[PDB]
Amino acid sequence: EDCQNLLKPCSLCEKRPRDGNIIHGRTGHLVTCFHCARRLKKAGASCPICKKEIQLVIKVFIA
């Protein structure tokens, strides 16, 4: 039931939905918008949740 966190706005900028998936290996953490996730990656920051290296950031569309 943690699926309801997808209703909350980006955990950082809070102006946008969480559509950035932070991908490390075959897993991913979707807590931020695409722009914030892309900016974390770009700054060399690791995943804010699990602190694993960020291999990829993708824009996620829920359907």
Partner 1 sequence: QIFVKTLTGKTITLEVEPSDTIENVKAKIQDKEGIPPDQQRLIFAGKQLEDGRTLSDYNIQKESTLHLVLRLRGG
Partner 2 sequence: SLPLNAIEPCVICQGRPKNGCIVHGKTGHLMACFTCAKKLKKRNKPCPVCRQPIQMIVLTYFP
> How far are the Cα atoms of 9, 41, 63 from residue 48, in angstroms, in the given order?
16, 10, 25
How far is residue 5 CA from its own chain's centroid?
12
Do 19 and 60 touch, CB atoms closer than 8 A? yes
Choose between 4 and 52: whose C-beta lies nearer to Zn ion. 52
Least spacing, CB of residue 41 vs partner 2, in Å: 12
The yes or no reply on residue 61 touching partner 1 (CB under 8 A) is yes
- Binding site residues, partner 1, CB under 8 A: 59, 61, 63
Residue ranges in contact with partner 2 by CB under 8 A:
2-7, 17-18, 21, 23, 26-31, 49, 56, 58-63
